[PDB]
Amino acid sequence: AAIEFDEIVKKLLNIYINDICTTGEKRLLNNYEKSILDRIYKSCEYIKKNYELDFNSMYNQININNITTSDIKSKIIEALLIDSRPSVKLATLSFISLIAEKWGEKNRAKIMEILSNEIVEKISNNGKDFIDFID
């Protein structure tokens, strides 16, 4: 019959349930975890604001068309592979956060499969030192 709103509903339902998932996840964090998570939001926003042009230049490097997710992942992780100070972890995470912000029209999967496995493991390594750095 009238199909002209079908895609809108599908799109808004995915956004809606992904958000409830996050809420469900946050709800089971204890207060210490909630406090660290908050520090992560704030530090990354600070870094994204203060290195905006750096990040824009870096963004244009990986927002080209002739590139796969594995290649983007390789470009981004390269700093950590040789230098894993928490400052670089924060820079790397903040950049990934910027990409997430900018790829709103893409499938969430194409941001999450940048972060997942190797990069998140590399950042999580010595997580205590990372937490100590931002807390």
Partner: peptide
């Protein structure tokens, strides 16, 4: 030798972050 530009810049930002957080 020469990192890809993205990694080169993240390391640059990383150094700068380190300097001010002191």
């Amino acid at each position: 030798s020469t990192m890809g530009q993205v990694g080169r810049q993240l390391a640059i930002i990383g150094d700068d972050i380190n300097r001010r957080y002191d």
